[PDB]
Each structure stands twice: as structure tokens, then as C-alpha cells.
Amino acid sequence: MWFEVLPGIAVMGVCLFIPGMATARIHRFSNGGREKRVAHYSYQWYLMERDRRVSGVNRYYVSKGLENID
Amino acid sequence: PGIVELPSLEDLKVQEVKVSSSVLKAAAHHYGAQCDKPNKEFMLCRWEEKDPRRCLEEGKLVNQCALEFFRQIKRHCAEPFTEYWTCIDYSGLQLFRRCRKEQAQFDKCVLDKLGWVRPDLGELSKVTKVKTDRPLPENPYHSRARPEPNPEVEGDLKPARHGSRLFFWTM
């Protein structure tokens, strides 16, 4: 009856779940298991470029804590 | 014109604060509390000299006082701070609001073991007064002598000599 639209709606819902889940897993994979750094403002970008400079491996996401200093 | 005068490469060598931005943002309020005085001496020197080359030594004091800020965290409260900057480091916009329990643990461990009060909402944006012994720069714009202005008008205004003197008009 009416519930035969539910396979098509379910397949459409899976096909809409794929982009958001995909970009979340890609942001966690390309950034060391964390969110993607949002730089809307130039201060956030300056901190991100500082992280890229202080990581030593030319990657902003590799974080260095108190173990880097003595 | 003249040779620009830059400091040498050995003049700029200092032990940098080699930590990430989330490590800095996690320790930011206690850094603004405890490392107040050389930071404000430096930023006062920086807005008064208007020249970074005349601000290096005070800047080194900043890089002297930040590291002693972190070692005193590293000697006492390394692990709650490590968990706290890790939780700050997870987020994209690096929200303080997503990490309040690690913040409470870090503030409790710091207030117990070191006796630092975290600054409240409104304190770190204050304009503070700084006691320095360096002289006030008498010409921070490297300006020169302003030209002499034109002489003003003075004296009582007498009538026009013989009127308008326009070809034949006697008034």
C-alpha cells in the first residue's frame, strides 16, 4: 500500500546520508582524528600557520604540547 | 636614500615557545594573569616605539616569561593540562564551551598546586598602567621640522584707500 514509497525514500535518505558522513570522516582522516580547523578570520589562520611552522613536519594538525619544550 | 638598519641573525636567536595554538589557547587566561608584566612592557614598547627593531629585548623577556609559565605547568599539572589542551585541540573553532569539565579540572589543579586565579569575564581586556624605566620616544615617527605657517592678520581694519580703485569708480 502506502508503505511502498519507503524503499525509495530509504534509498534517497541513504544517498543523502553519504555526503555528510563522508565529509566528516574525510575531515577526521586528513587532520589526525579531529575536526577540520576553521579559519574564518585571519587570526585563526595565523594560529593555524603558526601550528604548521611549529609542528616541524609542515602539517598544521600535528600538535606539539609541553613535551616539545624542556 | 639610506641603508635600512636591520639586526643580525644572532640578535634574533631566542628559545621559542614551540607549542601549538591549542596549547596556547588552553593556557591563555592563566598566561594573561601570570605573565602580565613583561607582556605589557613589551606591548607598551611596541606601540610607543612603532618599530620592532627597538622592541627586541623586551620581546625576549616575553619569550623568557612564557616558557617559565609552561615549565611551572609542566612540573606540577602536566596531565590535566594535557587532557585540557587535547580536548580544546579536537574542535575546529577550538571552543572553550565544549571543554568545561577539563577546564574545571585544570583550574582546580592549578589553584591547588600553584595558587593561580583564572581571570573572570572582563578582566583581560582592561587597559592597565605600566611602570617602565625606558624613556618616552620624543619622535617615534622620525619626523622633521614642520614648515613655518603663513603670518596671520592683525591690526584694525581701516577703510579702503580711495575706495575700489576700479578704473574710475571713486567709491
Ligand SMILES: CCCCCCCCCCCCCCCCCC(=O)OC[C@H](COP(=O)([O-])OC[C@H](O)COP(=O)([O-])OC[C@H](COC(=O)CCCCCCCCCCCCCCCCC)OC(=O)CCCCCCCCCCCCCCCCC)OC(=O)CCCCCCCCCCCCCCCCC
Ligand atoms: C543731514 C544728512 C542727510 C543729508 C542729505 C544730502 C543729500 C541729499 C540727496 C541724497 C540722494 C543722492 C542724490 C545724488 C547724489 C550725487 C550723485 C551724483 O550725481 O554723482 C555724480 C557722479 C560722479 O560725478 P563727480 O563729479 O565725480 O562727483 C560729484 C559727486 O560729489 C559724487 O559724489 P561721490 O564721489 O560720493 O559719488 C560716488 C560715485 C561717483 O561716481 C563715480 O565714481 C563715477 C562712475 C559712476 C558710474 C558710471 C557708470 C558708467 C556706465 C553706465 C552709464 C549708464 C547710463 C548713464 C545714465 C543714463 C540715464 C539712465 O557714484 C557711484 O558710484 C554711483 C553711480 C552713479 C549714481 C549716482 C546717483 C544717482 C541717484 C539717482 C539715480 C537717477 C538716475 C541716474 C543715472 C543712472 C546711471 C548712474 O556722476 C556720474 O557718475 C555721471 C552721471 C550723473 C549722476 C546721477 C545724477 C543724480 C541726479 C539725477 C537727477 C535727474 C534724474 C532724471 C531721471 C533719471 C534718469 C533718466
